[PDB]
């Protein structure tokens, strides 16, 4: 199949992934064009070779399984005491780029394999009951395997795109101010080690590797049975382990959401918007966290109304996603709904940016969720009153004042 795919057909699949078209329908179109142009009886050669396969479903399932980096959420948190000698392993810019180039190449080769596999699966569907001993099991198993191959294609397209996407040059003062704003959100436990950004061009994957993934490698080394500090360093095993681990962290379905968090922390808003644009239509794991990150990107872009819509969408998934749950866990105060705690956090952020109209809209929504807590309702209505008064909306400030349930605050 790969040897007969024209440059135009290869571009058509890559363009389909970029434009969020169904890769299954596009694989079917490429298959129609391949059958229409079958001058060399290649479909007969593929059929003859498929007849030599005893169980094509098991072979497809094996390829998809070796290409799947979906992680079950048991990445145990690091014990502190072994950090000091291994923190510098693979810490050079040369090693960072070699590892990130390994990902670029693996994701590129596996993207081609997933494309050609999708075309082959549509060929197997068209060949139907006439050629393979298994009529009823093939149709039912292909209904599960085609969407999986499509999801892997999109996942490898995303990793390939990220491995090629250049990071924006951000001034240190803008980064330090963004880290101060994110520290108000408690999204940053990491002290700014005075990283002279070595003023080299990096990809967003090289940036992610240096900032986040690197800190976890000493642990991956210890968990895998290297409890003896005496094993000699083997390049072949170590590069494979590092690359597989970094692929799990870059995986679009990863619940830890660390890749998008790293982009937000490094002020990579344009790349984060494009990453979220490419992810949201088909990945359902971190939807709330994507809308929250997108809302922060729109706030920095000055598009405060779109930011509010995205913050309101993110509020629905706050109890399901570990990243949004981290934003809630620090107020050790009495029984407030997790959505109201989230809205109180977004309200602090909209006040720090100085957008009083959006603070009023969000505080009005947050009063609807505060149905049982008269104290939170009093605080939110006092906030609405203050912002209407500051804006000079005297009638609306007076209306807000009459609705305050606390006579002392009123």
């Amino acid at each position: 199949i790969a040897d007969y795919i024209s440059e135009d057909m290869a571009y058509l699949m890559e363009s389909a992934c970029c434009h969020l078209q169904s890769p299954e329908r596009v694989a079917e179109q490429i298959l129609e064009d391949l059958i229409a142009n079958d001058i060399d009886n290649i479909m007969e050669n593929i059929q003859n070779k498929l007849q030599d396969t005893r169980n094509p479903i098991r072979a497809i399932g094996f390829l998809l399984q070796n290409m799947d980096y979906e992680t079950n959420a048991d990445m145990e948190q690091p014990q502190p005491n072994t950090r000091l000698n291994l923190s510098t392993l693979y810490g050079s810019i040369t090693a960072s780029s070699v590892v990130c180039q390994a990902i670029c190449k693996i994701s590129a080769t596996r993207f081609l394999i997933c494309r050609d596999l999708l075309i082959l699966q549509h060929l197997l569907l068209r060949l139907g009951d006439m050629a393979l001993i298994g009529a009823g099991q093939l149709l039912h198993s292909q209904q599960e395997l085609i969407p999986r191959a499509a999801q892997l294609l999109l996942s490898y397209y995303m990793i390939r795109w990220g491995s090629q996407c250049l990071a924006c040059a951000v001034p240190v003062d803008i980064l330090e101010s963004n880290l101060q704003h994110l520290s108000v959100l408690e999204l940053s436990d990491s002290q700014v080690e005075k990283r002279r950004y070595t003023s080299g061009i990096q990809t967003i994957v090289e940036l992610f590797f240096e900032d986040v993934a690197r800190k976890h490698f000493p642990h991956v080394f210890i968990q895998s049975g290297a409890s003896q500090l005496q094993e000699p360093l083997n390049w072949s095993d170590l590069i494979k382990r590092i690359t597989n681990y970094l692929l799990q962290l870059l995986w679009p379905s990863n619940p830890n959401f660390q890749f998008a968090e790293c982009l937000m922390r490094n002020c990579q808003y344009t790349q984060l918007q494009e990453y979220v644009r490419l992810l949201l239509p088909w990945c359902q794991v971190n939807v709330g966290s994507c809308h929250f990150m997108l809302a922060q990107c729109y706030l920095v872009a000055g598009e405060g109304h779109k930011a509010l819509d995205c913050f309101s969408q993110a509020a629905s998934e706050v109890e399901r996603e570990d990243f949004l749950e981290k934003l809630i866990r620090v107020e050790e105060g009495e029984s407030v709904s997790p959505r109201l705690q989230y809205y109180n956090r977004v309200l602090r952020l909209l006040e720090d940016v100085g957008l009083p109209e959006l603070v009023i809209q969000l505080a009005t929504i947050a009063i609807g969720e505060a149905s049982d807590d008269w104290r939170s309702q009093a605080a939110l209505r006092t906030r609405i009153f203050k912002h209407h008064l500051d804006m000079g909306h005297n009638n609306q400030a007076y209306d807000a004042l009459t609705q305050i349930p606390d006579p002392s605050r009123q």
């Binding site: 006040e351 104290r375 203050k386 500051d390 605050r409």
Partner: protein, 231 residues
């Protein structure tokens, strides 16, 4: 140069040139103050030249503060606070009469951020500015502006009440010593404080009830009742 750069090979030649003739301000800035990052001397140069760039003045004050905080990194938290206080008081007494070279709102904001970063006494900035002879009414106007600006920095630092704690210390100092304000403006100033405290109490009631917030509300009610005895 002799005190801070004695080990630098070029300083012997620089010092001998500075003895050999009186130099123009432009040469002093470009050949000595800039290459050696002498932010105090740069501030003195732009003051003497009558050159007014508010951004440059803020950057020079930042560099002076950051250098004093860096040079004191080996010292105790109290000694670091005292070193910075003596530095800012010494320069503040020179420039506070000329508002173009003493960016009071920037200085108060920046020093309060350092107080939060180092977990120093919230009284530090209010005390330092009063020792410079910054008028209590002008210092309150700056804190009132910084509080009303709702900077997200304070919430990110988990210190949303910090500016109100500094305001409480400032106004408690005025209530203890009403002679810090000239007798002719004292009545007007006490009324402005009562109106400002009433605004701060309304905003504190809109926030989530925390033990620290309830203490701040109690402090402002006690302060209100003391100011009503001074009016």
């Amino acid at each position: 140069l002799t005190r801070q750069y004695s080990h630098h090979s070029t300083v012997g030649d620089a010092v001998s040139q500075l003895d050999s003739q009186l130099m123009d301000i432009t040469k002093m800035f470009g050949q000595y103050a800039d290459p050696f990052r002498l932010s105090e001397c740069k501030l003195a140069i732009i003051h003497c030249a009558g050159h007014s760039d508010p951004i440059l003045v803020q950057t020079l004050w930042q560099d002076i503060i950051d250098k004093e905080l860096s040079d004191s990194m080996g010292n105790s938290s109290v000694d670091r606070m005292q070193s910075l206080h003596l530095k800012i008081t010494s320069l503040g007494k020179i420039y506070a009469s000329t508002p173009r070279y003493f960016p009071l709102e920037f200085l108060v904001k920046y020093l309060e951020q350092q107080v939060c970063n180092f977990s120093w006494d919230a009284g530090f900035v209010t005390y330092t500015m009063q020792e410079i002879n910054v008028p209590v009414p002008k210092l309150l106007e700056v804190y009132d502006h910084l509080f009303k600006a709702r900077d997200p920095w304070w919430s990110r630092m988990k210190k949303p009440l910090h500016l109100l704690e500094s305001i409480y210390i400032l106004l408690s100092g005025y209530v203890q010593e009403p002679s810090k304000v000239p007798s002719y403006e004292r009545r007007r100033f006490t009324t402005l404080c009562l109106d400002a405290i009433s605004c701060y109490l309304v905003e504190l009631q809109s926030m989530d009830p925390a033990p620290a917030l309830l203490n701040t509300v109690s402090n402002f009610k006690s302060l209100q009742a003391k100011l009503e005895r001074l009016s």
